[PDB]
Every structure is written in structure tokens, then in C-alpha cells.
């Protein structure tokens, strides 16, 4: 990096009204994607959580880890049940998600994490009864149905997480919770994320995903957007790709309960979160209530 | 129990004396065998644990789970090595250790204390560098040899996990940690019983077996002894049988450390902890210092 | 007691449900009758708060003394004036009052409760101004009429009291306290146990009594009733014995004042506290909203 | 009071340095003689220890009451015995002892002081343990003998002390403690103040005597002396009248044991503690180390 | 002074009714005129301030200089503009008024009250934001007209205040602050003091002044009164001297925003605030609300 | 700034190391020069110290002024005497250093800093007694000689200091100090920001200068040095300018104090304090001990 001094000291003074706006601020990151497979973009993600903590930034990191879970049931030759186009989860496919969010994709996380400094946690919502789930179904071409363990965020420990945000730490959060009869379920991602922001006051929602921002009428390049309002993008939602849906409802869901903006942002980008936090050059999409 | 209610009288006031000496102490646990295995011990195990806590006593639970790790391999269908009778640990290896111990066998710990209440919450050294690791060797038939990522518990950041226990919580200990270049080791969960307790400034070292008690001369009936010197049980060490050999070494390590008594007690027996430490009437076997 | 083992254990582990109820908790126990006479009745009771202090429960002793305070009377040779049944509290028989509750009946109490440890403190409501009285009459076959210097509980110092049991002690209270003017008055030991327990937030609320508990019909044996709720209970009042009714006034007003439960228990029984807690073997009468 | 306004002034700003030298300090003060028997000086001195706390000094008050116990004994006609020239303390006689002390010499002080707000506690050596007692030997015309059940002070809880203080209350204590094996003993005020003092890092020790000061060749009036050091004074112990000899060898053991000052004052002067802390107008004899 | 030590006495009890009822309590106090000027006096007010702060009362200096700005403005040689018979303050005048106010007139307090210990402090609105201005007019005339840079206390950082204050500090305040877009603006001391004392919930706000004390008919000696309400005495105000106006408007602010008395004191004496507050002999005016 | 996005994130990306190095630790900065004058450097040293501010570092200014008082004291008509180079400082000539200092040269920093929160306090020794002066003499020509109230800091209240800096607020220290007798000296900021920096055990101190760093033998180009121990810039101080010895002397005192390291930096650069602290790009040199 031959460049300049004298711009290398604008690029990090053109951070302060960034930093001031997020210091002692919980951050909400939703952490999946190519930005959790490839060696890289994961140690640039690790470090930029030391960032945010360095800068007494208060960050959550939520996982998914959809694609390790059904590689660990083919290795152990776990045969699915498919009702439309999800997967039934049985006890016995319950126990395999939560040994692979929590005992495999997890522990990578917080050990990256963790090469910075004591800050990395795991923990799921059976610890410490921190959060609880209820049975979500789904519907299948029409009639709602049930596929199993799988559920929506019901109730957030909202102070027992806070303590442990304020002594320092980075709570890694693998997704599965009891319900209210202490049985574990898988919840997605995606939700949990937007629900722990909501619950925990977050000053902003990240959702890293492999895509450049929301695109109104994909793929027309000019379609691109960078900021729009909750009432705008519930109205396009129905338009969506059925990957982008559940980025997209869980901002919906963050930013209607109070998060002050959600963002879509390129996992694919390196050091994205230092991009989308810290300069206005940022690829992803912004949505604000209205 | 149509037992007279002046004798539960009186076994109950008989508990006094131990609940004063473990009043705001710290008790580690270390749990494994058959009342890790079957329901009926698993859920009084539990709930002696929330019992500890609903008195104001600091219990820590150390966990092991060796028969799972195994057959999850072989499920799996991961071809091993074996150096004398060890199972070399390849990275491969640890990967299912640590995915099976903190992802599977800490889990259902966790959530059965919890039923109590919010008190357990699963950790292992990686989380905020609680306790790092020390490669191990191991000597077969005369020279030590290299068994791959086993190892010792190294350092303890005995504060962060005081604070933990401070707070009301149990924490539940998965073995495993990352040595001084951040690679993480599986660790004999015996030893680190010891090692926890001593870092900790415990009253108290429990360790569950599936045996009555400590037999010096075994099978001699006559030869079950009730408490014994840390002198005298190093004599005897190079006697015992090869299961014993751990656990005897664990409660050495720990008593010699400064821990003021470590017992080997009955895991076979429903509330083996209530027995050992609020009655007088324990068939364990009782480690001081002499 | 060469009862087996495994049953010691099932009445250690049948207490857990009530030591999560207690935990954190303000239990008032009124303390009188032959429970305060017969040292052995005596030192269970003192050895029971130990208990509770040593489970992290924070109990909270009123005593009486109406024996003692006539004993020492006739030994002063002091003349006694009597409207209806009751002693005329001049200033002479209230400095007598005060000098024995406080410095010879509660001072036997607090000596026993500290020979497990430094927990009881000696206090009357003229101390730091925990507590005020108000002057009460009686009615004496009709006409309300004047006694003397005798009054129920006023105003409490809820905040200051609740920070003495917080530092781990053992309040002992003497009945005593000043009026609006600082004219200290006699309060009766049972309505101010109540009143104590109203203003703490009490979990329970225990009365010592020499009798099994509650009869409706005294003296059939058929009579006797385990739970009654305040409705049903207030309207048994005019029929019992004059014995009962200050135990069961204070019942009523403990209860309909919020305390979610107030029992008559036996103090013929020893450690009937441990008992009435932590079985469900309790001979007392339970009093609930209703 | 027609004395001129621009003379009250200088009277309260001559009251800055010892303001300065006593704020956050403790002063422990024996208070006996007719400064306790006289209403006007009873609740002038009460107005001061008020007068202290509302400068946050912290006053800690010791009182005997010798006569007063005499007195009981003879209204319960109980037969002294008597070695030399001191009653025997019986078992009986402690109790009398204790619950005069403790219930009606300790009371009215209380109650004198909380005419100004909820500031006094009355307390003995048996609450929460705050000291214990050694048996102590007289020498009677030689022959050391026993007397009973009469000691010195043993331990103080220094560290429950200081927080009683702290949190703004006004100790006053009634010199009775247990010994090591839970006996209740008496202990001599004056002797019990020096320890207090002591043990609490005391600022000044206050001693109300019914004297002027101390004289070193009674009755000369030109022998009247305003400071002495220990040493000297030490030197002088064997010269002076019965009983002054408690009061001096209070203030030996009180000033070699490190407290600053020791103060031998005029009890029958109104608001003699104002005089001698906040004047340079005392009577009284000022012991300093040398 | 051989004045007798009883009387001593009596002086120093007598302000004990006013020890309790300010103990804890912010008392603000302006501070100018000859109070300012002469030595003996500032050291006496200097050695007051001590005084308040080594009773535990929570004294916070407002002061003026006028006068001062005036002589350094003739020293520099800037010529001033006046409208009415007020001087324009220009960026220049300001920056005049700000150094003389915050760099001498506040300094020398500083020192002087630091003469008795590390009690003050030295700020103005600026530092830390501890309260803002807006700007004011005044009428000359008629016609409301622009007088440049001078305002009135817009917002006060009550918390942060008090926590200089619990710290036991003596906030010595020079009135300059920042309006909304961070200009600084000089304010009149004597409303400052008002609205400080109405910010911090004030027990007291005292005016030092040159004069005895209100007069309703000056120059008759007759009508100097001694208490005062708001209602009659917002009537009277424009009865007023030119120089007792901005004085009473301060008390009237005050009272009426719930400062439970502003007293008017006559500056000229020493030790005027320890008269005012500790005796009954003061000479100033009480103002009440009514 | 076009420049593209992948290169904005490196470059913050880049002060990760020194965020962790600095998180927490007090850095004392010496701001003086052209950095002082010129006002988009002065507003970029604002906002670089409410960047550390807002990265929970914790910035201590100490500002100089030299040239603003000899203007202010020609505007006065206030002439000099001089010994050798230096002014005499009377007590006339500190009562306007302190009114230009504090009253001045230190608001403005203190409004600018300001302008993006509540962060700067302005202090001098007085306040609080935070610090001490002992009076320097100079050499001239040989003799050490006396020019007045000029001073070293002698003692600093490091405890009382620490705690302005945990309460998040920035300290802009204007270096004036009583001595031991309450007279005020002036000290030379250089001396005093070295002073500081080793009481409070600063991690850096940075010294803003109008030159690029040092030079070992000015003016060769090729003789400018990035860092230097101790030993060897000990030796070279008696060869560099008179401007240089001041700032290089404040190092040697600093890094032999403890300060870890001690950097010369360029005042003239726009964010020189970004660029030295959180690049490696610094045109600074670094003083470490050997
Ligand atoms: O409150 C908590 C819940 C789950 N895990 C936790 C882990 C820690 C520790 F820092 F010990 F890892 C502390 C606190 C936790
Ligand atoms: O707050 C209190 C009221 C009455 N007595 C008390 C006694 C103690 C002590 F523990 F010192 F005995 C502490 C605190 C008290
Ligand atoms: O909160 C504050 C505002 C302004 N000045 C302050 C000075 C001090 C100190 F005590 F350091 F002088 C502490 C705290 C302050």
C-alpha cells in the first residue's frame, strides 16, 4: 500500500461520525454465506468483530449453517423426509443440527474470533434459558403444515444478554431454543436474527448474504437500490427470489420493531462490515421505517 | 414414604453442618458413567445440581463422554489408529470430540439442569479463552509417544469463571481448549476435573464412578476403604486397575493442590451427590492431604 | 439412625421443590409457647434459622414473652391494675416489658442462633426507627377502654430492614416501639409479626403455636383442617377458642396484606420450621387468599 | 442570647479545623456519671453524637451503668457475694446485669438520640458477634481471684463495624460479649471504650468523667494539667483516687494502641463534647503518645 | 476572645437544627460585590465553603465580576458601544469577559477555598456541555434590542453536576456557556445562580449583596423586612432600586421554580453565610413562595 | 474521493492492531505550534481526540501558548525583564499567562472538541489540587539563576485524575500548579505533558511539533530517524537546536518514567494523531527505552 499518508488519514477520520453514532451500541450481525466458507472473507469477519469491540461497539453475531447440517446427515446416512420443499425435522435430524450449529460451525467462529482476544461466547437459547422458540409451520401449496422441530423466537433474556455484551463479550449465537416444554428446536437464521435485534435494542440489523443489495426487478442492473422504506419493500416482497425472502423479512420484522435501520450487505466483499459501518461507499441496501 | 415425620425431621437438620462448611463455596463435579447414561440418575444428577444452587453453593460440572465420541466415529465411519490401547487424534478425530462433547453431551446436561430454572450454561476453554491446553503424551510400553490433540488443561482464567459462577450460573465443562497457537485439544475430562477445581479454589472434588469406592486390595471386600491420605494413595496407585488409575490421579492432583478433600463416589446411586455431601452415611471414598 | 441410605437421599431430594420457592425469600416466623421454654424445642428452632440463613433463605424472628414479663413483675413486686382480663401497661410495667423482651428473651435467642455463626441481631422499632406504634384499645365487655402504653405496628421501615437481612442477618425482633411523640409501647407479638411480614414482602409467614393445628369444631379430632382460605377462616373466627384468635387475626391480615401463605404450626414439634418448610408432612394449618 | 451577632460568627468559624480533622472519622465516646443521670445533660449529649453524624463524623457510643445494676439487684433482692471490694458476678447476676444495660440503660439513649432522626443502634458483643470476651482475674490485696463472669474485650469484628457506621448509624453499645465458648460476659466500660477505639481506628477517644480533668496532686488546684503524654502519665497511674485509675488506664491502652488522641472531659458540663471537640475552651486532659 | 466556654457551647448547639436540615443538600451561593473584594472577607467565605463541604452539606459557587471586565476592557483600550445603559458585547468583549471571568476572578477563588483542601473546582458551560445559553435582549426604552453575545441558562446537565457534587467537589462557576450552535455567550451571574439552584434542586440559594437587606421603602429604616413571599414581593419590584432588581428577579425565579428559600445577605459581613445559615440572628430577607 | 472501496476498507482494516493496543490505556498528547493556529488543523485535532474518545482510548491534552501570552502582555503595555533568553515571570506576568492559558488559549480547544460531545473539561493544578509546581531555576551563560514563578510539576493526584479520564471525559490541561505554599507557578507544557504522562502511566506520549521528526545531524535529509532509544538520544541532545531540546527532554523523561513509547510528530500534518497512532505510515519519531 504505496498510497499516500495524507489519504490513508481521511479514509479514518471520514470514520467519526460512524464511530460516534455506534459507540456502547448493540450491532446485530446475521453471519452465513460465502463470508462463512471461504478462509479470507471468515478472518476478515473475525477481525472485524475485534474491531467493533475495540471500538467499544457492542457486537452479536447470529449463524446459519443450512448446508453443513444436510452434509453431516448424508455422511451419516440419514434418510430425509421432504413435505413441499423443506425438510422434516425429526429429533433424530434435530440432534444432528445442534451438534453441527453448535458443536462444529460455532466453535470455528469463536476460535477466529478469539485469535484477537478473550472476546468470543457460544451460546444457544437453552443456556441460561436465554431465549425460548415456538413450533413455526410452513405452507406447503397452500395448507399450512408441520415439518417438525422448527420454530420462531419466542422470548429474549433481554437483560441476561446484555450483561454479558457489557462485561466484554461477543455472544455467538447458534440458533435452536426450548419451547415453553423445555424440547430444542432449530430456528432459521435469518429470523432469530432479526428477532434478538429487536429484543436487544440493537442500533442496526447486518445481513451478510451473497448478493450485491436488494434488486427491485432483478435482473435489470439499474434496479439496484441502496435505501427504501419497510412499507416500499413489503410491497415488493412477494416479487423476490425465494432466496432473498427471508433476508428480507427478517428486516422487515427488525426495523418495524424499532432497529433503527437493517442492512443487506455483499458477504462476498471483504472486511464488508468495516465497509458498510465505517465509509458511505457501501454496496449494500438500507431499510428504514416508513 | 409413609415414614414418620419426626425422622425426616431430623435428616434434614442432620444436613446443617454441611450446608454451613458449603455455603458460597465452589464444588466441582466431575460426571460421567452410568449416571450419565440412564434417565432415572441422569435427572436426579440435575437436580442435586439445581439443589446445590437453590442453597447458595457454587457447584461446576465437568463432563466427559469417551463411549460417545467412539461410537459417533463409527458412525461416521472414520477409520482410527491406535498407539498402544489409545486412539490417536487426528484433527479429524477432535472435530467429532469436540462436536459430540459440547454439541451433543453437554447439551442434554444443560437443558436437563434446566428444567430447574435458568442456571447451566454449556462452555469450553475456546469460549473468551476460559482455559488453555498443553499438548500430552503418552508412554506405551516405555516410550512416550505422540497420540495427537490431547492434552492438559494448561492456564484457567480463574477470575472470568468465578464471576460466571458469581452470577448464579452452572457452568457445564466440555473438555476441550486451544493450546498456545490457538489449536484446540481434546483433554481428559478426569484430569481437567482436577485441574478446574484446583484453579478454582473448590471445598470440595467429586468424581462419579461406577464403582462403590476406592479397593486397595480388590476384590477383597474387606479392603473398601473410607478416607485415605494423599501419601498413602500414591503408594497405591501402581496397583489399581487401569479405569481407577484416572480418577485416583485426578483427586492426587486436585488435594495435593491445595483442594481440601477430593472423593470418589458411587455414580451407580440415584442423588449420589446429596448422599456424599449432606449425610454421613456415603459409600465413597474420602482424598486428604498427608 | 441406621436407616438405608437410598431413603436419607429421597428426603434430602423432596425438599428441592421449597428451597427454589424460599430461595431470595423473606420468611417471618413468630416465635412463642413452649417452643421458647424446653431447650431442645429451643435449639432445633435456633438450629432451623441457621438452616435457612445457610440455603440462602432470609428468615426473619418476632418473639413475645408474656410469661416472662408477669415473672418478672411479681418479682419486683410491682401491683398490677386489670381492666377486663388484661394488665394496664403503665410506664413502669412497659420499662419492665421492654427490659425483658429485649434484653433477656431476645438475647437467649440471638446467643443460640450464634452458636452457628454470626447471624442474629437484636432490634426493637425504636432502633434506627425501623418501626413505629400506634396506641390500640381494647373492648372490654363493650366499651373500647384504655390499657395503657399498648399498640399495634404503625409505619415500617421497609427499605432499612430489607438491607439488614441482605448482609446475611438474622433479625431478632423484640415487639417494642415508639409512637409519633417517642413514647415507646408494647406491641403484641403476633399482630406484629404480621404486620412485619405485610411490610417485607414475605414469602410465608410462620406462627408457633401449642396446638396441632386449626380445629373448626374443637375438640373433635375431625375436625382438624391442613388449608383454609381467609373468606371461610375470618368467618370461623368468632367461634374459636381465646387462644386462637390473636394467631388466627394475624393470618388474616398477613394474608389478605399479600403474604402469599401464613401457617399454624406445632411448636411442640421439634424443628417443626425444617418441617412445615421442607415436607409435605407438615401437621399445620396453611392459610391462603380466598 | 443578645450577644452580638459578628460574635456568633467567630464562635462557629473557630469550629473549621477540628470540622476538618474530624469529618469521616470515628469518635468513640464513653458516656457514664451525671452526664447519664441529668435529663438536661442526658439530652444535651444526645444533641451532640445528632450534631456529629450531621457533619458526617461518626460517633460510636459506650455506656456503663454500674449503679443502676445495684439497684435492680437490690429491688430483686438478690445477696451479693464480695471479694475485696467487688460484687461476685453470678450467673444470675449477668443476666440482671445484661438486661439492664442492654434493655433499659442502652434504650433510653436510643431513644434520646432518635429524637433527632433515625440514627442510634443498640448493640452488645452477642449481636452478629461483633466481639468476643476474655475472663479476667482482679488482684484483691495480692491474690489475683476470680469474680465471676466479668472480662475484657477479646476480638472485634472491626471490618461489621465500620459498615454499620458507614451506612450512617450511631452505635451504642452495651459491654457485654460472649467468650469462646458462647458465656456471656461483662466487661467494664471504661476498659471496653479503650478496645472500641482501638480496634476501629478510632480518631479521639472521649471519656465523660464527673471531674474537671485530671490532677496530679489532688487536691491542689495548681495541679490541674490540660495534656500529658503516655508515658508520663503511666508514670503517674499509681498515685491517683480509685476512681480515676479505670478512666487513665483507658486512655493508656487507647493511645499506645495508636489512637491519635484520648480525652478525659467533665461530664457535668452541658454539651461538654461540642466544648472539648470544636473549642479551644476545654477542661478537660488531653493523652498523647510519647 | 474570654468569652465563657458555656456560651461557646450554646452558639455551636443552637446550629444543629440547621446542621440536619442541610446535611446532604445543595445550597447555591452567588458570590460578588465587596464579599468578593476585600481579603478578610473572601478568605472568610473561602473558609466557609470548607465549612459546608466538611459538614457534608453540598455548597456550589456561582460568581460575577463585572467591575473586572470592565477595568480590563479600559486596560486593552476597547472602546465599547452602549445601548441604553449597557455595553454591546461584541466576539472581542466576549472573549475579554470569558478570560477574566474563567482565568482570574474564578482562579482566585479557587486557590482560596483550595487553601482548606482539594474542595474546588473551577467550570463554565462549555466544559463537559454542563449547561447551554440562549440568547436574550433587553429592552431599552421600550424597544427590545439586540446587546450582542449575552443570554440567559438555557439547559443545565443536572446529573452531571451532582456527580461533581457527590464527589465532594465545590463547583466554583464562571457564567459563560454555548447556545445551540456552540457560541458562547456571557450571562448575567445573579440569574445563573437562579436557575442553577432551580436545576439542581437547590435546598437554598443565597445572593450575597452590599446592602443590610430588602427594603420595601428605602431609605426608611422602618420598612427593612425580614421574610418575604413571592407574591408580595414580585408586587413590589418595580418599586426597586436599579441595582436591587436583577438580585430579587433571581430569588423570584428561583422560589417559584421550587427552591424553598432565597435569602438576600449582606455581603459586608464576615462570615456571612455561616450567620445566615447557622443562627437566627441573620440579617438578610427570606423569600417563600405564597 | 473516488478511491475504490476495497482499498477504504484495508486501510481501516489496518488500525485494528493498535485499536487493541490502545483500548483502555490513557495517551497524553502535547498540542502546541502550528497545529494550534491554524484552524483546519485545530479542528482536525478536535475530532481525532473525540476519535479516540469514541474508540474508548483515553486522550489527556496538555496545551501550550507561549506566543498568545507575550502578545496578550505587549497589548497591556506590561514590559519584561530578561535574564539571558528567558522572561521573568512576576507575579504580574503569571496572573496573564493564567487569564491567557486557561481563560483562552484552553476554551477554544475545549468548544471544539465540544463540538462532537461532552468530552473536554478544562483543569489546571489549582483545581482540585490535581497537581503541584516546584520553582525551577535556569542556567545562563553558567549560573543557575531565579526567573520567577516558573515551575516543574512536582506531585500529580493521579487517582483523582484517572477517574475524570474513566467518567469519559478528555482533560485539556492548561500547566499552571500551586506549590507547596498555594503561590500558582507557570510551568512549560513540554516538561509538564512528560510529568503527566508518567503519572498516570500513560501507554504513548505524542508531542505535536512544526518539524518532521527528528534529526541526528540537521539539516542532512538522509539524517532523520524513525526511532531511537533512550541511551543514544541522551548523547545526541546536546547537539540539536534550542527548539528541539525541550520536546526531545519531555521524551527522555517520559520513556525512562515507563511511558512505553514517546513519539515526536508532525503538528503540520492534518490528522497527525490518526496517522501516527493507527498507521504505520508516520513521518514521527519513536522513543523507546534503552
Ligand atoms: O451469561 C452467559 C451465558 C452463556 N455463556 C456464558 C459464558 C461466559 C464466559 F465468559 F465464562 F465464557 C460468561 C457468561 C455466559
Ligand atoms: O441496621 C441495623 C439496625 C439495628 N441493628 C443493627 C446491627 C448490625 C450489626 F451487624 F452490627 F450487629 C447491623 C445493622 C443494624
Ligand atoms: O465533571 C467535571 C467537569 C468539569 N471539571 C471537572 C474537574 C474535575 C477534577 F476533580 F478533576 F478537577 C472532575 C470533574 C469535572
Same sequence: chains 1, 2, 3, 4, 5, 6.
Avoid at 423426509?81 to 451438534?99: I, N, S, Y
Avoid at 436488494?214 to 439499474?222: E, V
Wanted: aromatic share 4%.
Amino acid at each position: 500500500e504505496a498510497l499516500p499518508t495524507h489519504i490513508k488519514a481521511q479514509v479514518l477520520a471520514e470514520a467519526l461520525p460512524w464511530l460516534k453514532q455506534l459507540h456502547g451500541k448493540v450491532v446485530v450481525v446475521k453471519y452465513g454465506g460465502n463470508a462463512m466458507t471461504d478462509d479470507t472473507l471468515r478472518r476478515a469477519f473475525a477481525a472485524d468483530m475485534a474491531f467493533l469491540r475495540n471500538c467499544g461497539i457492542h457486537p452479536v453475531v447470529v449463524h446459519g449453517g443450512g448446508p453443513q447440517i444436510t452434509a453431516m446427515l448424508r455422511r451419516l446416512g440419514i434418510e430425509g423426509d421432504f413435505k413441499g420443499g423443506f425438510r422434516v425435522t425429526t429429533p433424530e435430524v434435530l440432534d444432528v443440527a445442534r451438534m453441527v450449529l453448535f458443536g462444529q460451525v460455532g466453535r470455528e467462529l469463536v476460535n477466529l474470533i478469539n485469535a484477537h482476544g478473550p472476546y468470543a461466547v457460544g451460546i444457544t437459547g437453552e443456556d441460561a434459558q436465554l431465549f425460548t422458540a415456538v413450533r413455526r409451520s410452513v405452507t406447503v401449496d397452500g395448507v399450512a403444515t408441520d415439518i417438525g422441530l422448527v420454530g420462531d423466537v419466542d422470548q429474549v433474556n433481554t437483560a441476561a444478554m446484555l450483561d454479558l455484551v457489557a462485561a466484554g463479550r461477543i455472544p455467538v449465537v447458534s440458533t435452536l431454543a426450548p419451547d415453553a416444554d423445555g424440547v430444542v428446536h432449530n430456528i432459521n437464521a435469518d429470523t432469530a436474527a432479526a428477532a434478538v435485534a429487536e429484543a436487544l435494542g440493537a442500533e442496526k440489523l447486518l445481513m451478510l448474504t451473497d448478493i450485491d443489495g436488494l434488486y427491485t426487478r432483478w435482473p435489470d442492473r439499474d434496479s439496484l437500490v441502496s435505501e427504501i422504506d419497510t412499507g416500499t419493500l413489503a410491497q415488493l416482497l412477494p416479487t423476490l427470489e425465494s432466496g432473498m425472502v427471508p433476508k428480507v423479512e427478517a428486516c422487515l420484522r427488525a426495523v418495524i420493531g424499532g432497529v433503527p435501520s437493517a442492512h443487506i450487505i455483499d458477504g462476498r466483499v471483504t472486511h464488508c462490515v468495516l465497509v458498510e459501518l465505517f465509509t458511505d461507499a457501501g454496496t449494500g441496501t438500507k431499510v428504514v421505517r416508513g
